[model samples]
Target: NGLAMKTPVSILQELLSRRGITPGYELVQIEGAIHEPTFRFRVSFKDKDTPFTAMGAGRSKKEAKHAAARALIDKLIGAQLPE
Candidate 1:
């Protein structure tokens, strides 16, 4: 084995905790969009003081990094987000 990463839930919780966010509630979704790209879990937050967050990673070049950021931005605004 070369490398391994933490699970989405664990990673998300860890990140939120790092920022002093307990994330009272959350959700996750795996999504795909034609040949544009596909990504991991999209999450929602019920925090009154915080924001909902999405978690995803791309499959290819424009797919992986670019697309991952795109996916996050989508849920961020619930609309198209450019990088």
Candidate 2:
């Protein structure tokens, strides 16, 4: 039950860890008003000989990071599937 509650960030981290890869997140930019700012982040990692990156935006840093993680997770999973 608790496994279903895992966030995208945690899921992605574990997935990459199993493959001997480490993911990195960088703050791209902040936008919007002072009262309600938007946070943008870029998630990047190297998978063997290939490098990948994804971007996410949200009202908070954590949210943005999660979004980027989710994006990267989708790409990685999709790439693993046979065409």
Candidate 3:
């Protein structure tokens, strides 16, 4: 927690990269006007068949992706780390 990262996307990317894992992102749903659309993103480990998934939503793709990654990071970190 001391890292005090700047962004959720970067933190997730760093953790995954260090593990030599490739994360898959999907734009599962999109709605609202094209100019101001909301997105639903899924961040999965390895691939679709890997059986792990994180989901998020935002007004923009990047934000939605970051939210998804953050959700995953929170879950994984909590499970993997010792307090």
Candidate 4:
């Protein structure tokens, strides 16, 4: 319904910087948005023997992210993580 500014990475960077804990290996520079055909991720590992999966599609970016979160939640359920 409203615009959402992506805040997580910036927030993480801020916290780390304040603590003087450089997340050198973990932090990757994220480029600002580029207009694109769509956003999607397909991950296959263990040479395809173990195929962990994710699928995301939506009418808008907010919807796209909801789809992504749904997938993550399903994984979390199997791992017994609390919401």
Candidate 5:
């Protein structure tokens, strides 16, 4: 699956849709100067009992979103990670 994967964001979206899970993202942090701002995001599914949550940080909100999704994706489907 990793050999034919899409962006981290896309992969997460598909997984959620297939499982009828609604994803939520909470803004975890925002630091750094205005010239080089940073964003941190945390994502979770509607299933509240999940043992893990996705996290991401980047220079932009979009990137941070992807980062969080990527983290979750790895936890969900990383048998070989890059396989």
Candidate 6:
């Protein structure tokens, strides 16, 4: 049997929600051809009094959103454990 899995988007949402913060995503831009268009998304959230934002791009909207979520997760984790 295989283990259950979670997507980066859902993981990020859970992380933010645990801290009582809500994350937001928006389509920043789109490019390329109709058959294979590139989507860019921007993710923003506020932690306490500080605001954080990240951007990601992919061939589809879902992929772009996942990329954005992963980026934000990295940012938050790094911020919490910096050198």
Task: Please list the Cα RMSD from the true structure of every candidate, rounded to 1 decimal place.
Answer: 10.0, 4.9, 4.5, 11.5, 2.9, 5.5
Worst 10 residues of 6 by lDDT: 1-10
| Candidate 1: C-alpha lDDT | 0.44
- Tell me the spans in candidate 6 whose CA falls farther than 4 Å from its real position: 1-6, 79-83
lDDT of 1 by residue, 2-68 (tens): 1125343344444456566543222233356776545443434545476665454556443343344
Of 1 and 5, which scores higher on lDDT? 5
Model 4 residue runs over 4 Å out of place are 1-55, 79-83
On TM-score, the candidate that comes out on top is: 2
What's the TM-score of every candidate structure? 0.28, 0.74, 0.72, 0.31, 0.73, 0.72
Query: lDDT of each structure?
Result: 0.44, 0.79, 0.76, 0.38, 0.75, 0.77
Pairs that collide in candidate 3 are: none
lDDT of 4 by residue, 1-83 (tens): 01125343343344335544431111112223465445443322222244344454444554454444445434534542222
Looking at model 1, how many pairs of residues clash? 2
Question: What is the number of residue pairs that collide in model 3?
Answer: 0
Error of 3 at 81 (Å): 13
Q: What is residue 1's positional error in candidate 4, in angstroms?
A: 28
Q: Report RMSD for candidate 1.
A: 10.0
Clashes of 6: 0
lDDT of 6 by residue, 1-82 (tens): 0112655566666776778776789999999998999999998987768989999889899899878877887787674211
Candidate 1 displacement at residue 11 in angstroms: 0.4
User: Which segments of model 5 are wrong by more than 4 Å?
Assistant: 2-5, 47-52, 79-83
Per-residue lDDT tens digits for candidate 2, residues 1-83, read: 33256765677667877897777899999999899999999999887699999998888999988788777877977742121
User: Which 10 residues in a row give candidate 4 its minimum summed lDDT?
Assistant: 22-31
Candidates 2 and 6: which is better by TM-score? 2
